Structure prediction request, 266 residues.
Amino acid sequence: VVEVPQVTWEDIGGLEDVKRELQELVQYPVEHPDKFLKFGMTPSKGVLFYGPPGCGKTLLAKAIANECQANFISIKGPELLTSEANVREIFDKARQAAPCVLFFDELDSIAKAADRVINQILTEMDGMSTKKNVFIIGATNRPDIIDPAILRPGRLDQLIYIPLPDEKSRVAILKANLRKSPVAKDVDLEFLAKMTNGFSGADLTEICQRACKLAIRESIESEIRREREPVPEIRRDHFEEAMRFARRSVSDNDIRKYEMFAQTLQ
Ligand SMILES: Nc1ncnc2c1ncn2[C@@H]1O[C@H](COP(=O)(O)OP(=O)(O)O)[C@@H](O)[C@H]1O
Ligand SMILES: [NH3+]Cc1cc(-c2ccccc2)no1
Ligand code: NA
Prediction:
């Protein structure tokens, strides 16, 4: 289905630098059109996100569309395999749905015939102007096998690193996930951030989801019993129990590889 996503910047913990860069990348064409006319700037057509899984690349693509009040179309890389006109029809539908964000997920899978489902993608991008109001976003978990042809000017304009959350970011992710939940006052999220070094954003969300379930199942059972004869909260002890099916999903070795890739691009 095609729709404007509900996720906002507020749902995304950390990545504050990345967020104002993306805002500037899309707010500037419509907030200062006179200066965009004055100097000859063409709006950006695309970005490529990279980093470990579960750290917010999909969330950021949906928040960009929500900011622009734009439709969102998602395509996972493995599913363009049956048929090179598959690529042509997706760009048609995105153009039909303009203004629109077109998100290519799991692009590392086609980075490994398939040789130019790629060329088709590259040609569709070259043949589409910024006047069509379609903004393209790709995401990958394997930045080592990016064909640099997709980063040439006129295609995806910027490669952007989306890293594992640091300690400050882990507090923000917990707070964003819990922003509309009733959390007991004995819950110390800064201490939970201290104890989750190396956790991804998806890893943190599971802890919150397990603690919230445990609370619901407590609420269910206690009213079942009080029947035999006041909004409840997620308490510290629900979080205590959730945290021992809690472990990192990204290895220390993959973390080293991402950090090396990113640090060498300064
Ligand atoms: N920065 C973040 N802030 C808040 N939640 C996050 C963040 N990163 C990941 N999550 C949680 O993990 C889930 C997966 O994130 P996603 O953006 O799909 O990861 P990927 O980087 O693999 O695209 C999200 O739905 C959300 O619950
Ligand atoms: N097993 C997953 C995996 C990840 C990587 C990798 C390679 C380069 C940079 C970052 C990550 N190589 O393999
Ligand atoms: Na990923």
User: Anything to note?
Assistant: The CA atoms of residues 198 and 251 lie 9 Å apart.
